[PDB]
Design a protein around this ligand. Structure first.
Ligand SMILES: Nc1ncnc2c1ncn2[C@@H]1O[C@H](COP(=O)(O)OP(=O)(O)OP(=O)(O)O)[C@@H](O)[C@H]1O
Ligand SMILES: [Mg+2]
Length: 230
């Protein structure tokens, strides 16, 4: 297991009840695992907890290897698009080329005045929400971590681009097919294709299993599909 969490409780503020309570799960190395649940149920917080960005009140957390993150709202550094991807790393080919292609960046680069050397962020070219998201994906993919935490990574891109990113970056035929990948998503579109789904409610885990297992149970996952998925 690349991730092992045992009866773990995490807080953003000791003055109030913890946001995440009694979290217990293990993720096999190389698994693709979705995390779903009603808006506000604690999905982003779960990723923050794994990044050691919350305060662990109690419990056990063991994470094997490096961790990359694609946050829920993409952000841009004041620098070239290239440096927004490299983010401290040296540029290496053909890996860089593969990341550009996989993250659907070619159509964006093609209309930029200096391609990837274009200054983006403050006082530079004004990227769209979809463009920022593709840059954010590329930043994480380029770092070539062992574990990927994706916070609703297809929300800001259109359906066609989303399909490209799932196929080339996230899924079993993508370039990260050997990595552990945790996929928070509000969408049902790719849930049949993940290995395991973790359903959350109220800062706790309600149930875990495959798409087919959870669907048949007609419990929390079935309710997510009927009422919350969008
Ligand atoms: N970076 C942060 N700093 C402080 N509090 C946070 C942070 N991120 C989330 N929270 C808090 O955690 C609680 C659960 O919200 P969280 O954002 O984890 O839910 P979510 O399931 O990701 O919601 P959504 O479906 O809207 O993305 C909320 O009180 C929220 O304000
Ligand atoms: Mg969230």
């Amino acid at each position: 297991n690349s991730i092992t969490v045992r009866n773990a409780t995490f807080t953003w503020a000791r003055s109030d009840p913890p946001t995440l309570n009694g979290i217990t799960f293990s993720i096999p190395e190389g698994a693709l695992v979705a995390v779903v649940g009603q808006v506000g149920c604690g999905k982003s917080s779960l990723l923050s907890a794994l990044l050691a960005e919350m305060d662990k009140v109690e419990g056990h957390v063991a994470i094997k290897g490096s961790v990359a993150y694609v946050p829920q709202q993409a952000w841009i550094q004041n620098d070239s698009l290239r440096e927004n991807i490299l983010f401290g790393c040296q540029l290496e080919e053909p890996y860089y080329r593969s990341v550009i292609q996989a993250c659907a960046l070619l159509p964006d680069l093609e209309i930029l005045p200096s391609g990837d050397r274009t200054e983006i962020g403050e006082k530079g070219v004004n990227l769209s929400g979809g463009q920022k998201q593709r840059v954010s994906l590329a930043r994480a993919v380029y770092s070539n971590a062992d574990i990927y935490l994706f916070d609703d990574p297809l929300s800001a891109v259109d359906a066609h681009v989303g399909k490209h990113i799932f196929e080339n970056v996230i899924g079993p035929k993508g370039m990260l097919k050997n990595k552990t990948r945790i996929l928070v998503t509000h969408s049902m579109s790719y849930l049949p294709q993940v290995d395991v789904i973790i359903v959350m409610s109220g800062g706790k885990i309600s149930e875990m299993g495959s798409y087919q297992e959870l669907l048949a149970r007609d419990g929390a996952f079935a309710e997510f599909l009927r009422t919350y998925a969008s």
